[PDB]
A paper describes a structure:
Human aldo–keto reductase 1C3 (AKR1C3; also known as type 5 17β-hydroxysteroid dehydrogenase, prostaglandin F synthase and 3-α-hydroxysteroid dehydrogenase type 2) is a member of the AKR superfamily of NAD(P)H-dependent oxidoreductases that catalyzes the reduction of a diverse range of carbonyl containing substrates, including exogenous compounds and therapeutic drugs. AKR1C3 functions primarily as a 17-ketosteroid reductase that catalyzes NADPH-dependent reduction of weaker steroid hormones to more potent androgens and estrogens: including the reduction of androstenedione to testosterone, 5α-androstanedione to 5α-dihydrotestosterone (DHT) and estrone to 17β-estradiol. AKR1C3 is overexpressed in prostate cancer and most breast cancer types, which makes it an excellent target for the treatment of hormone-dependent cancers. Gatekeeper residues (W227 and L54) in the steroid channel determine substrate orientation, while the oxyanion site, consisting of the nicotinamide ring from the NAD(P)H cofactor and catalytic residues H117 and Y55, anchors ketone, carboxyl or alcohol containing substrates in proximity to the cofactor for enzymatic reactions.
As can be seen, under the assay conditions used, compound 2 inhibits AKR1C3 reduction of PQ in a sigmoidal, dose-dependent manner, with a resulting calculated IC50 value of ∼7 μM. Compound 2 was found to display selectivity for AKR1C3 over AKR1C2 and was shown to have no off-target affinity for ERα or AR receptors. The structure of AKR1C3·NADP+ in complex with this C-ring fused bile acid tetrazole was determined by X-ray crystallography at 1.4 Å resolution, revealing that the C24 carboxylate is anchored to the catalytic oxyanion site (H117, Y55); meanwhile the tetrazole interacts with a tryptophan (W227) important for steroid recognition. The asymmetric unit comprised two molecules of AKR1C3 with clear electron density for amino acids 6–323 (chain A) and 6–319 (chain B) and the NADP+ cofactor. The electron density corresponding to the 3D structure of compound 2 was clearly visible in the AKR1C3 active site, in both monomer A and monomer B of the asymmetric unit and compound 2 was modeled with full occupancy in both active sites. The overall structure of AKR1C3·NADP+·(2) is globally similar to other AKR1C3 structures, which all contain a characteristic (α/β) 8 – barrel structure, and a highly conserved NADPH cofactor binding site.3,41 However, comparison of known AKR1C3 structures shows that the conformations of amino acid side chains and supporting loop regions involved in ligand binding are dependent on the physico-chemical properties of the bound ligand. Overall, binding of compound 2 to AKR1C3 relies on hydrophobic contacts between its steroidal core and residues lining SP2, including W86, S129, W227 and F311, with support from Y24 in SP3 and F306 in SP1.
Residue numbers in the entry: 6 to 319
């Protein structure tokens, strides 16, 4: 169940989200990534920031070595952290991710965020009064370095994450552009459905990939605990009842029917096995209109620590 990207590669339309907070033991990423592959996931979304690429890579290598899948069956995404936007830092950052994951290439390498941070290995640079330290980098030069990673064969495809229309246009208009972004991975769910951005992306043959499609993990460091809980929504729950599915499955299927590639994080064996059932049923045009009606521009991520960054995309 795949979509063709604008560079000719194919992306599975359902992806497994791997982020877990630091209070989850690092062993769990290995267990749940194997469970995801066993359940039928074939797109796996990770990042240098997640501190999990060793365990996620081991899971992938394990399922290839045991004969369950071949390397070409798995679509593995990593992301360039914002302390590595300076062009000379991009290839070493990807090479380090590949060494940790024990992989020869990623299927997809993303710019994690347009909001550049002080260069270096320290992923959370903070000043003498605890403020996040920004950097000013032309993201077109970061992009040129991403392009060289594709030409070196280290990334099959390259894309971006957390870009707005203006930031996408900056790449599309870059002089001497070699490769468009294949995707823009953004926050997208029935409370923030990104309809105009989605329209724009489709018009440029850029795939919108939805994160927080089940309403986020609601980590109180990053998400307002007063925010409404997406999966408690009465329309999603009534549709779940109507279809004998679950609110999560309704929220996933909604994205597939609108041409969005959707991620789903779960570290729970039962919910991992549940989520792959998204391909078993369909929402009517009336159901889709009811879910479109939930849109309220609700951003679970309010990036408060990136206050005043010039590249803040919202
Ligand atoms: N590019 C970026 O900046 C960025 C930002 C955020 C996320 N991401 C990526 O997108 C992924 C997903 O987004 P997310 O981490 O915000 O989480 P999410 O996919 O919105 O999931 C939120 C929560 O839903 C629960 N869940 C999963 N399946 C469910 C089911 N069938 N029924 C009920 N609850 C269910 C999970 O809890 P359990 O684990 O307890 O099942 C999970 O913690 C991340 O892991 C990461 O790979 C990227
Ligand atoms: C849940 C986010 C991860 C999203 C993802 O799944 O890609 C958090 C985890 C780490 C944190 C990083 C962790 C390192 C550092 C911690 C600082 O106190 C705040 C800035 C930040 C870059 C934050 C920024 C942030 N703002 N809202 N969410 N975040 C993220 C990216
Ligand atoms: Na740090
Ligand atoms: Na513009
Ligand atoms: Na458009
Ligand atoms: Na199924």
């Amino acid at each position: 169940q795949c979509v063709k990207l604008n560079d000719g590669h194919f992306m599975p339309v359902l992806g497994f989200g791997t982020y877990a907070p630091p209070e989850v033991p690092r062993s769990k990423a290995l267990e749940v990534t194997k469970l995801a592959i066993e359940a039928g996931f074939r797109h796996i979304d990770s990042a240098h920031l997640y501190n999990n690429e060793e365990q996620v890579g081991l899971a992938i290598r394990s399922k290839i070595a045991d004969g369950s899948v071949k390397r070409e069956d798995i679509f593995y995404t990593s992301k360039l952290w914002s302390t590595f936007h300076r062009p000379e830092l991009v290839r070493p950052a990807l090479e380090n991710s590949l060494k940790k994951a024990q992989l020869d290439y990623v299927d997809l390498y993303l710019i994690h965020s347009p909001m550049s941070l002080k260069p270096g290995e320290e992923l959370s640079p903070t000043d003498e009064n605890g403020k996040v330290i920004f950097d000013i980098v032309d993201l077109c030069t970061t992009w040129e370095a991403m392009e060289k990673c594709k030409d070196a064969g280290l990334a099959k495809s390259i894309g971006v994450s957390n870009f707005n229309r203006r930031q996408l246009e900056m790449i599309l208009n870059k002089p001497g552009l070699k490769y468009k972004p294949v995707c823009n991975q953004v926050e997208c769910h029935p409370y923030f459905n990104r309809s105009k951005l989605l329209d724009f992306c489709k018009s440029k043959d850029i795939v919108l990939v939805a994160y927080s499609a089940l309403g986020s993990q609601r980590d109180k460091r990053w998400v307002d605990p007063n925010s409404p809980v997406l999966l408690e929504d009465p329309v999603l729950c009534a549709l779940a009842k109507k279809h004998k599915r679950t609110p999560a499955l309704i929220a996933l299927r909604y994205q597939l029917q609108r041409g969005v590639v959707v991620l789903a994080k779960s570290y729970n064996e039962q919910r991992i096995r549940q989520n792959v059932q998204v391909f078993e049923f369909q929402l009517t045009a009336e159901d889709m209109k009811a879910i479109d009606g939930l849109d309220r521009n609700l951003h679970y991520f309010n990036s408060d620590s990136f206050a005043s960054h010039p590249n803040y995309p919202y």
